[PDB]
């Protein structure tokens, strides 16, 4: 979408594989605000909003909290406390046309600045002066939007770049979007420090001969002590035996 009319996609109830985006070299800008770019997988949020737009090279610096300019103030404004990472890459060989690619537009003239994540898509001819335009362009009557002359012969500062901003929103909600989870090899007949989903402790795990119901994740004994767990991956039932100890 055009930067003046950015396409907001809500990401929820899914596994956010941030390691691919971080590890790859396809992006030229990767500015993370409020999160650590190498710890992003461990941060769970209620909503993730993917703001997709194209800006010019010189304006990539403007896709940040606190920036100003024709785009930052009249097209796509970010809040000072924006949380998320801004990812952008050079798209010169994708959007530019020999005769100039003018299909990408941005808003240049507006009565006031946008609110965070405000999408103003009005096409009313902007009245800059005091004379009503009444649908006629002229003195003090300027169209509020203007197109970009994207061409393959333009310098880098005028080449198109594709920018994707992943906005991280945490609401009073379960927080359904998280990164991939770590898993390790199962160790049997030895004392290990284990963590099965949310069940943690120390003990010896052996093959179980117990039969759990299809919806039961772990077993607990008469003293509220965990004595069996279901393996989250292979649906094996494992008994937890406390590590041998005693007086000497």
């Amino acid at each position, epitope marked *: 979408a055009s930067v003046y009319a950015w396409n907001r996609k809500r990401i929820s109830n899914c596994v956010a594989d941030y390691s691919v985006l971080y590890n790859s070299a396809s992006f030229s800008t990767f500015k993370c605000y409020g999160v650590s770019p190498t710890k992003l997988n461990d941060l769970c949020f209620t909503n993730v909003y993917a703001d997709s737009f194209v800006i010019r090279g010189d304006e990539v610096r403007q896709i940040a909290p606190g920036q100003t*300019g024709k785009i930052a103030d*009249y097209n796509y404004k970010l809040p000072d406390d924006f949380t998320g990472c801004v990812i952008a890459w050079n798209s010169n060989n994708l959007d530019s046309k020999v005769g100039g690619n003018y299909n990408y537009l941005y808003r240049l003239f507006r009565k006031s600045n946008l609110k965070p994540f405000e999408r103003d898509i009005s096409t009313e001819i902007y009245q800059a002066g005091s004379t009503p335009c009444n649908g006629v362009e002229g003195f*003090n009557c300027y169209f509020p939007l203007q*197109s*970009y002359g994207f061409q393959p012969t333009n310098g*880098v500062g005028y080449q198109p770049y594709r920018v994707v901003v992943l906005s991280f929103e945490l609401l009073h909600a379960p927080a359904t979007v998280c990164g991939p989870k770590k898993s390790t090899n199962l160790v049997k007949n030895k004392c290990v420090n284990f963590n099965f989903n949310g069940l943690t402790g120390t003990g010896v795990l052996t093959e179980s001969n117990k039969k759990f119901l299809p919806f039961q994740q772990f077993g607990r004994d008469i003293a509220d002590t965990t004595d069996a767990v279901r393996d989250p991956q292979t649906l094996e039932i494992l008994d937890i035996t406390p590590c041998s100890f005693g007086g000497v």
Partner: antibody
Amino acid sequence: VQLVESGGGLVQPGGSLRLSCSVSGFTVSSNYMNWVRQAPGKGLEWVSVIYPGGSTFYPDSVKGRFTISRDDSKNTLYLQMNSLRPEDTAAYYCASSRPPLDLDWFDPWGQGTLVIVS
Amino acid sequence: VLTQPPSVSGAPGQRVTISCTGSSSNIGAGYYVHWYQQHPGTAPKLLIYGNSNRPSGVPDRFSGSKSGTSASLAITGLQAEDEADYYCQSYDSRLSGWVFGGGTKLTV
């Protein structure tokens, strides 16, 4: 449209000027505005860049000294220079309405304000 | 500041141009070369905007082309309309400055 600058002239060293940059036709409140200074034999550098939302950018020429503004009621801009450096001896320019696939950057210029700042 | 020639001299009738070499963020000054025909003693008047493009009221002389870190501000059919001071401008480094080049006082 007509942009007549006022307030330029001779002012003693070190002071501030509340000059006004009148504009006709286009009520000067909501166009991307720029103000520049250009001494004789010198070039015009953007002293300030008054974004129509309100943001002001003073890249090179002005340094914490000059304030670009507009009087909303009269549709005429005001060109504040205050705490002018001995380096501020120059003339003013305050017009930005680009057009009449394009670029449209800093097209017009008004009558200008000529100031002698010793 | 882009390197602009100090001056341009000639009598009217010979095809001429005002080349202006300046990276100005590359892109031929971002096709953002604001060429202005500043009259001597009068405030600058823009001649051509969007260097390749001719703004309203531009003379038949008006022309403009930018290559790499260089520009070619051309006036065709040298006539009385050409004798003026010329100024070119572009964003400072890579900003939205609209900074100005060396300035070309074309004097006949």
